[PDB]
Amino acid sequence: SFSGYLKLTDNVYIKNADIVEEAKKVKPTVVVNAANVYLKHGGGVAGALNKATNNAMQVESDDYIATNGPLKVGGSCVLSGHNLAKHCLHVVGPNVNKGEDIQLLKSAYENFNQHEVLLAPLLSAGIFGADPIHSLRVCVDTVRTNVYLAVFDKNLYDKLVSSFL
Ligand SMILES: CCNc1ccc(C#N)cn1
């Protein structure tokens, strides 16, 4: 189904790809969003996925927050995948740039175990400020379901693969 991924472990795969383009092509059952507790999809993966939905993700997310309140750091919710996937699993990894606890990254990845297969970014990486090498390590040590990681940055992808233990 997913093409061109490098197998890291029994269940973790990685590719240098734009997660928006991966989602449009594959139309996976689940695309993971690098969400914040307010589901305000301003930038990074969230801003990019929301822009690909023509803001439908943000409109749906605002209604979800109006009804349910904010998510917890380390938590998630399942919403529509719009034109990108059947569902979007909005997962909140800790944002180290907001001083959040990096220990919550394992809790964030545990949300992936509720889905047999997912297309996902590295949680807390990019604008969330965590070390992406550490994120990949927590991913491989926490996620047991099939996760296809899309890493937008080629230089970061090369660093992640070449340093993977
Ligand atoms: C070009 C649109 N796609 C993407 C994918 C990932 C990120 C990040 N971070 C930003 N844009």
Which is the closest atom of ligand 1 to the Cα of 52? 2
Supply 150's token pair. 């899309």
Resolution (A): 1.2
Phi, psi of 145 (to 5 degrees): -85, 175
Ligand 1 in reach of 132 Cβ (< 6 A): no
Closest residue by Cα to atom 2, ligand 1, is 48
CB of 151 closer than 8 Å to CB of 122: yes
Residues near 63 by Cβ (< 8 Å), separated by ≥ 6? none
3-state percent helix, strand, coil for the chain, nearest multiple of 5: 40, 20, 40
CB of 27 closer than 8 Å to CB of 162: no
Say if strands 30-35 and 6-7 run parallel, antiparallel, or are unpaired: unpaired
Which residue among 50, 54, 119, 152 is best mutated to probe the pocket of ligand 1, counting the most ligand atoms within 8 A of its Cβ?
A: 152
Of 47, 95, 103, nearest to 71 (Cα)?
95
Q: How far apart are CA 162 and CA 80, in angstroms?
A: 35
Supply 30's token pair. 């689940």
Ligand 1 in reach of 126 Cβ (< 6 A): yes
Question: Residue 107 CA to chain centroid, in angstroms?
Answer: 13
Beta-ladder partners of 15: 150
Vertex 157: Cα angle to 101 and 130 (nearest 5): 10
CB of 14 closer than 8 Å to CB of 8: yes
How far, CA to CA in Å, does 31 sit from each of 49, 144, 157? 9, 16, 19
